[PDB]
């Protein structure tokens, strides 16, 4: 059986400068070798050719989701944004239902959620645009409470979000500020009910600290030396009516992880954390589905992914294997699958333990021999159709800062990467040899400090095959195309990245 490989270096891109880039810095014979011999293009793995916004360094996540469904697969904050900019989101049922809840009952909407442009949990623009809708559909009164960030963005930086949205009010004539928190207390994650129970207070105009004004409640803070993320929750003197019943709430963060919690207090009817009385005939509606034990309507629903290449590659009879150490299992496996657990018919998977350490820094090579020892085992059974390799080792010791760390650790890789593609190559097989996003190409600064990110640089993409010429750019969606190109397979109408290879 001849094989068909993607082999992903996590964290590995093309990058002019030779300064702080370990990629360019490490001895890669391998890598050289077969850029030198096979058809070589590069392609995009950050921002809009992945689902992201403009200018956001790509991840493994997002990559290993693109890769897998061969198509852009749009994030929720790209969604959002597109969503608002074409109309969609003013027409959205379970925004409109929420606010036909409240103007039939004559009763309030409440808006929750992170009130900066970090992009990580929300986006602020997003509550203009719900002020805004609530103004075209008549509603009445409308509560702002607000979450301040001071850790996706600059640290004290909640007085300027304030500032323009207290000017929005204004321009629209509808929507004020009635409590204001650090994230801290409303968008904990670790069961902190303790905390949670202070922001709740101030959102119902229970007990807390009462202001004239949203800065001047904060500017308070900072005097007492308090940051944004930690502003102790308060209400805003005359512009809290409390939560009653009939009332709706729109929460605007789209990331689940860390208002889930607050959004059980209000809408899980199990919940238990600390003593409540819930609000009667609440409309609670969420950006996105935070957990399932949240009685909410959806706003923007998942999409499920159909014909990833793992679908695919059942559908047409063949084997596939799936191989990484844990720091990339997920990505080669689950997010690769399309945010799917369960394994395809002719699924078989490989997790290699990776070292127990604090920092990869102290183990370059990770477990990367373990990995391409594994990888030569399943070869040797003749039995594989298709393989999604990670190394994981640029991306993961890269993080570390740290620049002989990182070369020694793309140089374990190389040798590995030999190993694995001449055994391919002796199987008369192909290999794309190609990463999900950069990272080990710039580990330091233009002065010389630690850079323990991502980048946005693109990706090099190395295919085996003789006598063909390669597509000059693409994205990470044409990578699954070209292996069905590889492999012979026919490529359906959803999946629609390009193969990379020229016909
Ligand atoms: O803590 C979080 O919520 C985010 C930062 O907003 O960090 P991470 O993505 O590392 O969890
Ligand atoms: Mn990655
Ligand atoms: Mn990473």
Same mark, same amino acid.
């Given at each position: 059986?001849?094989?068909?490989?993607?082999?992903?270096?996590?964290?590995?891109?093309?990058?002019?400068?030779?300064?702080?880039?370990?990629?360019?810095?490490?001895?890669?014979?391998?890598?050289?070798?077969?850029?030198?011999?096979?058809?070589?293009?590069?392609?995009?793995?950050?921002?809009?050719?992945?689902?992201?916004?403009?200018?956001?360094?790509?991840?493994?996540?997002?990559?290993?989701?693109?890769?897998?469904?061969?198509?852009?697969?749009?994030?929720?904050?790209?969604?959002?944004?597109?969503?608002?900019?074409?109309?969609?989101?003013?027409?959205?049922?379970?925004?409109?239902?929420?606010?036909?809840?409240?103007?039939?009952?004559?009763?309030?909407?409440?808006?929750?959620?992170?009130?900066?442009?970090?992009?990580?949990?929300?986006?602020?623009?997003?509550?203009?645009?719900?002020?805004?809708?609530?103004?075209?559909?008549?509603?009445?009164?409308?509560?702002?409470?607000?979450?301040?960030?001071?850790?996706?963005?600059?640290?004290?930086?909640?007085?300027?979000?304030?500032?323009?949205?207290?000017?929005?009010?204004?321009?629209?004539?509808?929507?004020?500020?009635?409590?204001?928190?650090?994230?801290?207390?409303?968008?904990?994650?670790?069961?902190?009910?303790?905390?949670?129970?202070?922001?709740?207070?101030?959102?119902?105009?229970?007990?807390?600290?009462?202001?004239?004004?949203?800065?001047?409640?904060?500017?308070?803070?900072?005097?007492?030396?308090?940051?944004?993320?930690?502003?102790?929750?308060?209400?805003?003197?005359?512009?809290?009516?409390?939560?009653?019943?009939?009332?709706?709430?729109?929460?605007?963060?789209?990331?689940?992880?860390?208002?889930?919690?607050?959004?059980?207090?209000?809408?899980?009817?199990?919940?238990?954390?600390?003593?409540?009385?819930?609000?009667?005939?609440?409309?609670?509606?969420?950006?996105?589905?935070?957990?399932?034990?949240?009685?909410?309507?959806?706003?923007?629903?998942?999409?499920?992914?159909?014909?990833?290449?793992?679908?695919?590659?059942?559908?047409?009879?063949?084997?596939?294997?799936?191989?990484?150490?844990?720091?990339?299992?997920?990505?080669?496996?689950?997010?690769?699958?399309?945010?799917?657990?369960?394994?395809?018919?002719?699924?078989?998977?490989?997790?290699?333990?990776?070292?127990?350490?604090?920092?990869?820094? /102290?183990? @370059?090579?990770?477990? &990367?021999? $373990?990995?391409? *020892?594994?990888? +030569?085992? =399943?070869?040797?059974?003749?039995? %594989? !159709?298709?393989?999604?390799?990670?190394?994981?080792?640029?991306?993961?010791?890269?993080?570390?800062?740290? /620049?002989? @760390?990182?070369?020694? &650790?793309? $140089?374990?890789? *190389?040798?590995? +990467?030999? =190993?694995?593609?001449?055994?391919? %190559? !002796?199987?008369?097989?192909?290999?794309?040899?190609?990463?999900?996003?950069?990272?080990?190409?710039?580990? /330091?600064?233009?002065?010389?400090?630690?850079?323990?990110?991502?980048?946005?640089?693109?990706?090099?993409?190395?295919?085996?095959?003789?006598?063909?010429?390669?597509?000059?750019?693409?994205?990470?969606?044409?990578?699954?195309?070209?292996?069905?190109?590889?492999?012979?397979?026919?490529?359906?109408?959803?999946?629609?990245?390009?193969?990379?290879?020229?016909?």
């Amino acid at each position: 059986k001849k094989p068909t490989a993607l082999i992903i270096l996590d964290g590995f891109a093309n990058r002019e400068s030779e300064h702080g880039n370990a990629v360019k810095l490490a001895n890669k014979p391998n890598f050289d070798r077969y850029y030198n011999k096979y058809p070589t293009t590069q392609i995009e793995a950050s921002g809009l050719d992945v689902g992201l916004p403009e200018g956001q360094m790509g991840n493994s996540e997002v990559g290993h989701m693109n890769i897998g469904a061969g198509r852009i697969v749009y994030q929720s904050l790209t969604r959002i944004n597109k969503s608002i900019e074409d109309g969609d989101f003013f027409e959205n049922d379970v925004l409109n239902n929420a606010i036909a809840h409240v103007n039939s009952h004559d009763s309030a909407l409440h808006i929750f959620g992170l009130l900066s442009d970090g992009g990580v949990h929300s986006h602020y623009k997003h509550l203009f645009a719900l002020l805004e809708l609530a103004k075209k559909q008549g509603v009445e009164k409308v509560y702002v409470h607000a979450f301040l960030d001071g850790r996706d963005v600059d640290q004290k930086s909640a007085l300027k979000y304030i500032e323009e949205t207290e000017a929005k009010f204004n321009e629209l004539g509808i929507g004020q500020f009635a409590s204001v928190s650090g994230r801290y207390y409303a968008m904990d994650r670790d069961k902190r009910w303790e905390r949670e129970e202070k922001a709740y207070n101030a959102i119902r105009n229970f007990d807390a600290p009462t202001y004239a004004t949203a800065k001047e409640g904060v500017e308070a803070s900072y005097n007492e030396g308090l940051t944004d993320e930690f502003v102790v929750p308060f209400i805003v003197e005359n512009q809290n009516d409390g939560v009653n019943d009939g009332d709706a709430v729109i929460f605007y963060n789209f990331r689940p992880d860390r208002a889930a919690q607050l959004s059980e207090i209000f809408a899980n009817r199990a919940f238990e954390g600390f003593k409540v009385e819930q609000v009667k005939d609440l409309f609670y509606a969420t950006f996105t589905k935070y957990n399932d034990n949240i009685d909410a309507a959806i706003v923007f629903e998942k999409v499920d992914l159909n014909n990833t290449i793992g679908e695919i590659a059942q559908n047409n009879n063949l084997t596939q294997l799936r191989i990484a150490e844990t720091e990339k299992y997920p990505h080669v496996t689950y997010f690769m699958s399309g945010g799917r657990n369960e394994e395809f018919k002719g699924e078989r998977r490989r997790l290699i333990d990776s070292p127990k350490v604090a920092t990869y820094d /102290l183990k @370059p090579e990770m477990s &990367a021999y $373990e990995v391409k *020892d594994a990888l +030569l085992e =399943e070869l040797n059974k003749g039995d %594989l !159709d298709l393989i999604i390799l990670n190394f994981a080792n640029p991306d993961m010791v890269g993080h570390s800062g740290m /620049l002989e @760390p990182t070369i020694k &650790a793309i $140089e374990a890789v *190389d040798e590995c +990467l030999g =190993e694995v593609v001449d055994k391919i %190559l !002796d199987m008369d097989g192909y290999a794309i040899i190609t990463a999900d996003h950069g990272n080990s190409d710039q580990v /330091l600064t233009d002065d010389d400090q630690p850079m323990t990110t991502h980048t946005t640089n693109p990706v090099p993409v190395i295919v085996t095959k003789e006598g063909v010429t390669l597509r000059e750019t693409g994205r990470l969606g044409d990578l699954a195309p070209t292996l069905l190109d590889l492999l012979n397979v026919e490529q359906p109408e959803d999946m629609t990245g390009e193969s990379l290879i020229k016909h």
